[model samples]
Target chain A: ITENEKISLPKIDWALDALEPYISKEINDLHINKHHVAYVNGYNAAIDALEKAVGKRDLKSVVEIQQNIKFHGGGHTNHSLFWKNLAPVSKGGGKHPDTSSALGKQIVAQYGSVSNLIDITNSKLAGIQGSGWAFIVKNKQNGGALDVVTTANQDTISAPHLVPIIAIDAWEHAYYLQYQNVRPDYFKAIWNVINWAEAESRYSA
Target chain B: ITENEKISLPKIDWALDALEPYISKEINDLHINKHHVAYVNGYNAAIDALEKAVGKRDLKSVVEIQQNIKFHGGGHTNHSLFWKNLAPVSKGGGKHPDTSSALGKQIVAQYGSVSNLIDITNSKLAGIQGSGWAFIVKNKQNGGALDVVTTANQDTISAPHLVPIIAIDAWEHAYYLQYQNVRPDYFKAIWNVINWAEAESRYSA
Candidate 1:
């Protein structure tokens, strides 16, 4: 019998209030402690349900629980990556990694400059009709061409075909307390805490 | 050539402040005046873009433009229904139609009682992982059996498979102004403005 316990929410290296002036203390506290924890719990619960159904050979239950796994599993997976993708301003949060670096050079090659990417990303994020994410993704099908894409409601970028190097949460809860209805403002401010080094590593790796 | 103009934002029969104490003035103003207007504009823009693509015989552009139409069209369709499904409490908003009426009897037969249906609906909405809508729909496959379903982001309940009689927006923007993180409270409060007569008319028709 596989005795694998459910995945746990990862611990953030910085304090909850550390990424201040960009993402506020209140947002971090609620987002990490409450929202992210719920996803982890939900993923575990879905896994447990699926395991029980499989043991009993209940194919119907297994099929029924797929969405729960996808939604919660995506939430957990996305948020885990999201935490490490941020840092305090003093610790090199907003600064773009060296343009001489492989990923930085690649970004320059594709989108002209990191500043242009931000402009495009903000425009795309603004156009999203509902809660979702905006991602800077690598399209493996197109010879690893970097592209901007959007996915609705906790869906991840499809792996193998499209690998997400950086993600911006466009869900209102991610910024509503601080930014209110002006999502464009939130999009503009989030750049201040983007851990470019971490993003570069993900892209290069 | 079919000459269909851009979809216009449906006008509200009641004043902006009509749904107060249940849904605040700010919520209605922003949700209807701003958010709904944006969808109508977006749907028209997508249609315009698609028409241009078709005129140019650009197959790839046509394929790429489909999602914008779906997202914006769904937003327009859902919001139109949502507005009609609400009324001021004084105008028989929260009051259920006669239990002996055609729609009332059907609801009772399927769900035991209207209160029971509300319980199920509320519970279901609370579980949505992201922005979406909860619907009380009639399943064509099950000989028109009533069922609860959800659609992520701007997606509408599929017309042939699941005909939506009632829908509740679960997107944080729908309730964040007043309810904030307490979505359950917002869910509960929304019922007080549900237009039973409108729902019954839709069901009976």
Candidate 2:
């Protein structure tokens, strides 16, 4: 409701192409173009409107806009990542590398194996009670063992010292068209397209 | 290791059957019959040995034994219910009855509508992050508003005042094979087989 309406941002497709088989075209259309764009618009409107009122670049004012940003900005950022995180099965939708990436190696040593991390991640992913994310974070100090953590809503894994190597969006919009009541399908199919190299880079960086 | 490893349990076959199209037989076979059976056996073994060690019905020892019992027991119960939770597509797996039952009416009054509650349930289910269950609970104090909750590793939803009305299992073994990384597909698919009659009975009781 605050002044966040004026800024024009780059346009990106709301739904990624390969996301279709699991998330149908209709859903992708509404999700990306409709739902996501609405957030961007809301976010910009809040920022622009509020900035005018405050009359200067106020960090405190920005902090005051936190909720709006979270609700709208989060939807925008999350959907952006969510789309890129997916691809059509034809475009290597869920492909993981045969060889373990560096982060994979660290997680393997920390957890036991890549499969074990996945098992733990799957296990954690199965019990979150509401919109949230499941992540495997490297303890780095805990002898490099990765831990499975869950956070509600658009909370980022980077917020903590735990190094995020993998994350899965647990929003219904992420998978409703395809799996229906069975989230396990969404979880499983995603492994095929995990960017292990990106994960490794994040872990190393 | 503990003793009494010979304890046996029923092999819930339908649970595997429910996820056929999305999950493969090989995965289901190993997950329920083999993996779950191991936990059941492990639980009984822990109980038998621990019970005898801390003799004469020690409450503390019983509590410790009960932890494993409940964890594995919940696994048993979860898989059992998970089987009933699903039915064949020929039997209306994804679609629930349009006509409202008494419980559906109650749910509608409590949560807006049957579809809204299910939507909320599915949305909440999407948030689960590990081996556990997503549940719709009746709030005893607030006159039983439908509440969404989740538990880790088969942990029951019945806490001091909450009564479980619906449950969605989120185990990797639940949907890994067919859905692979696409848990959303399995999430959506299992709807065809939901045992609403059973759910209705529980709601009324």
Candidate 3:
């Protein structure tokens, strides 16, 4: 994608406090306003610096700059998708899939049930040693079968065949304020705010 | 590294509340009892599993398991050093290094002043995009001069010519309970508890 202008933060559908009890307003406010916005700002700065480096033919500097491009760029991309992955309870947050939809049928067929899929996902999330994400993804190579995978730091699932459907931010900042060192609790409570309708749309895509 | 025994957690030099205010008792209680202990367990588990995998000749799985060994072991090592790097305020925790000591001379010679070095370290800590650490290290290649660097996701400075002296954990869990997404404050506050006495001892070695 060619960019002449800077990328901007995507607006969330619900108020920051809408995910409360499961995720505190205090957490969401800092997460969105401070953390994710910093990523956007970092990405913008990196992109501008990289453009200058390329114009000057600073090849070695370009090599070093690429990681920031990928890292900050991926941060921007992942957080953008993550905002759409949750809903306010009033707007059908935590609502189960119709069971007739492509996503629901696929979830059962692959993992036996949505609860099992969540269990599998939570297991993978817990196994991550540091900042990373566990995604319930669709593998086009396997006839669009469902699978779970993780990415370290801000590395994204950019392979042409693997489509990340459910993006869970397993980074410590995502939950440390609310859960402290007890991250498993955050993993369990977050499902209460997940927007399965969005997962269905991504799965169908 | 023979594997007849499991690696155990190292006892901190002081009580959990020793570093209070700068680093909270609640944070350390969880950090030591839960987070650090978990790394010790994880490292032990990975070591035993690897031994079993080798006995069974599951070579490919062994390759996959090595990352766990490194990540968990590094977490143990880094946290071990991090604890020693700080002191309770009652002791010489925030006290400056003796100007007559070799380390004191080196610190001023290498970075001009301790405060300037801290400023430089804080800047590097802020630049880390994700879970990581910024360290004030002694580089053997530079005639044991002081240098600051960062490592991502539980990795350690184990290079033969590089000795990591001061480890500042930039990981969200290290400070997020108290600081939330505002990590710069933690980086700034951490210096107040740095054990320059311990640093001098290490640098002398």
lDDT string, candidate 1, A25-77, tens digits: 99888888888888888888898999899999999999988889998888887
Worst 10 residues of 1 chain A by lDDT: A1-10
User: Model 1: per-residue lDDT, tens digit, B1-205?
Assistant: 2456768888797888899988989888888877888889888888999999999999999998898999889999899989999999888889986788767887888888999999999999998878889998876677667888888888898677667889899989898878777889999999999998987787667
Scoring only the A-chain of each prediction against the true A-chain gives TM-scores of 0.94, 0.73, 0.96
- Scored by CA lDDT, what does every candidate get? 0.85, 0.63, 0.88
Ranking by TM-score: 3, 1, 2
Q: Which pairs, if any, clash in model 3?
A: none
lDDT for residue A151 in candidate 2, whole number 0-100? 74
Error of 2 at A133 (Å): 17
Off by over 4 Å in 3: A1-4, B1-4
Scanning candidate 3 chain A in windows of ten residues, the lowest lDDT window is: A1-10
The 10-residue segment of model 2 chain B with minimum total lDDT is B1-10
lDDT of 1: 0.85
TM-score of each: 0.88, 0.48, 0.92
> Which candidate ranks first by DockQ, i.e. highest?
3
* Stretches of candidate 1 exceeding 4 Å from the true structure: A1-4, A127-129, A138-145, A157-163, B1-4, B138-145, B157-163
> How far out, in Å, is residue A73 in model 3?
1.9
